[PDB]
Design a protein around this ligand. Structure first.
Ligand SMILES: [Co+2]
Length: 74
């Protein structure tokens, strides 16, 4: 459902700030910015892993369907 991606990220990574946009408005492919203190000192690969974990396999094709930008809070 709409908002479900954002909900799962925030449930799985407590304290995360999430910005989700629906690429092409197609209800299929998305881009997400996730900012979380738990990401500080982790590599981008490590941060993305935490986001994939948060989605708990609910999003088919997530490797290509959820384009990620992650960072520690500024
Ligand atoms: Co696809």
């Amino acid at each position: 459902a709409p908002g479900d991606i954002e909900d799962m990220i925030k449930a799985g990574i407590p304290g995360a700030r999430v910005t989700i946009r629906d690429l092409a408005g197609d209800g299929d492919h998305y881009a997400a910015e996730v900012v979380a203190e738990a990401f500080r000192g982790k590599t981008r690969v490590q941060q993305h892993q935490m986001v994939y974990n948060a989605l708990k396999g609910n999003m088919g094709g997530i490797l290509h369907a959820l384009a990620l930008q992650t960072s520690a809070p500024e």
